[model samples]
Target chain A: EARKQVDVFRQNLFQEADDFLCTFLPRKIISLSQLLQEDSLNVADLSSLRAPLDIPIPDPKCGYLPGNEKLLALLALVKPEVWTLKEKCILVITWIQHLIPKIEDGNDFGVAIQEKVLERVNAVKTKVEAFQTTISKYFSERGDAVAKASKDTHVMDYRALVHERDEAAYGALRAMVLDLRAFYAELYHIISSNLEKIVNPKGEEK
Target chain B: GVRLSGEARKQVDVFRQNLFQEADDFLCTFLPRKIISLSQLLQEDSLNVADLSSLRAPLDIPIPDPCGYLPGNEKLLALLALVKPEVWTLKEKCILVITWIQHLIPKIEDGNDFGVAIQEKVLERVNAVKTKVEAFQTTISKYFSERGDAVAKASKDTHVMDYRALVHERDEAAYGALRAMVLDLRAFYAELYHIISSNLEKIVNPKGEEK
Candidate 1:
């Protein structure tokens, strides 16, 4: 099947990907990151999300983790009537790199697995947009403590507790975000390096 | 037999995702890193935090200082968040996660864990951990307010553009990472709710329960 795919859809998708690989190099992947990124049911709408109720909430690699169809779907757009194995590699790898920076520096690779991932968190977008949107709305709705507003000793101390809790909450949440992004980054790096081995066996790429 | 229209179905799913997003967001905020100790958390061999290759970077060394940088509110926040978490449904799933963290002992100082303790060595420390969480939290509160006032006073004279630029720079650092954070957190909760919706196994049964 790998050979068959190579034969039909080669250099048609990539210029750089094909330039590197000339022989047999299988690309079907088997990793948790790819599995999680791929496991969506066609990405139905504005936002698609998953939850981790393990009832034993499982890892992305286990059954029902879905697979990375969107990347395939996106690459699906570049199909050509005639293809070359060399060109296809370059095409996918090139496209992947192109989208790499698309994910804001701190984000994960899977975020870019689909068309929407890149758009949701575009790099170089206005920085204020993130906190402004979330807390700005939070302010208008409950909006009590925007600027430490109490003079009363009792109220002030209690209020202090509330804000401190929220700040700590916000910090921890983002750190998790940071940790999760790191996982995505490492996984992508692992997969990318593996692909490079196929492109230039026994050594680093030229 | 009941039938639903496509539009109605989409609405339901979206609603489910949103609740899940909120709950997932909710859990991580309260939970992310709270149970683990500071020394254990930053130890080179610690599993409390995922390395993502930062430690393995070319010519990497065992950085002597675990805190990495000076201890500020920034460092403190990081320390607290990494402790551990538990949560429920909304409130229900919050309890699931809270219990999850309680039971997540992972290792005997050697740092190895897989998340399912079946409550092993967990119930014993439950009350103590709970009390400490409250105290650690207030400490988080105290430090933030002190530093916050200093920041506000410092910013008192800066231009609007200057402030905006600061915000820009801050997000410039975290924009991408945070985006995926919300999504991943959402997924966890959404999945939890889905599991709950799917299975009717009340973790807490009646009379003698698994306490």
Candidate 2:
């Protein structure tokens, strides 16, 4: 009985890892955005980051397993072009890799702190749509504007307008991305440094 | 964060994750639904369902906007009304309905409700099971429920973990999770089948009954 189930088990774990990542990441972005919202980081403000990553991992041939394909897929789908978003993802994932233990333990006797880390990271959805909309428009519509403006630079000034709009949005997104990356990086670094020992990085499915 | 109960830990985890997503989406809720053992439910350890008796009255059956909620929910609710499920958070309503049907299924051997006609009771049991099985089937088969369902059919296999529908291709992490879970369940189920077959064989051909 057990062996039959185990034959089924390997496939299930691969599936679970995918689902678990989907569930966790989006919330992290939501929370990270909330934190970013407070600090003045970007001018082009209407932002977006899905709790579940907006990126897609490519499909493997039948019976073939994915091999760091998500990392590649995520990089490919989301793209660095989204106001330094790629950088932010690396920073946040790395931060999570470090602070996770302290967050789990919920302690700190030697050195004192007031609120918990998750509380600091907490954020909800819908707020970042402003930024999201801005990013989406820049990519989707940029081609149209550039195509039109190139035909007649003097007469077709719309591309300039789009550029101006995209130009500012990029600034806002960049600042916010960097701010969150640094904020989480430093916050997690301190807590991580304070920890006595590191727990194995496994079993974070919620 | 991961709770294990029912069948085996590996497959059970996949089941609950799949179940939780469907139930939460069906209820149009955002509240997290962690899976705990039934003992947690039985011991008054779960959702403020302590006043289950008060819920004995007709369930309010708040229907999410008929148009906005998943299709067939009205019919689903109508079917669910037979057992009169209790509600807490909109999310908890799904499991509560499951609980009520389970409550109604107490073995009656000959199926007599206090000497009343047994047909109604038997039919009710049959209906409840039908609805439960159907609801799970339809909800599980939803493409939007689990991403990798293209390769894995939720309708055919209970072990298939669903991908959130927002994407097109296989989810990177869920695919990995499924692989790990399959390995674990294979061992568990093999032993389980062996033990079951042995016990069933013994029962059929008891000691000295067979040469």
In candidate 2, residue A49 scores what lDDT? 18
| lDDT by residue (tens digit), candidate 1, B60-162 | 1122211122223332234335432322112344444454443333334333222222233233333333443354345335444534443353244221121
Worst lDDT 10-window in candidate 2 chain B = B159-168
Q: Give candidate 1 misplaced runs (Cα > 4 Å).
A: A1-186, A189-206, B1-92, B96-155, B159-164, B168-178, B191-211
lDDT by residue for model 2 over B87-130, one digit each (tens)?
11322443443433333333454533332222233334335434
Model 1's chain A TM-score stands at 0.24
TM-score of chain B of 1: 0.24
Off-target runs (Cα >4 Å) in candidate 2 are A1-116, A124-133, A143-157, A186-206, B1-211
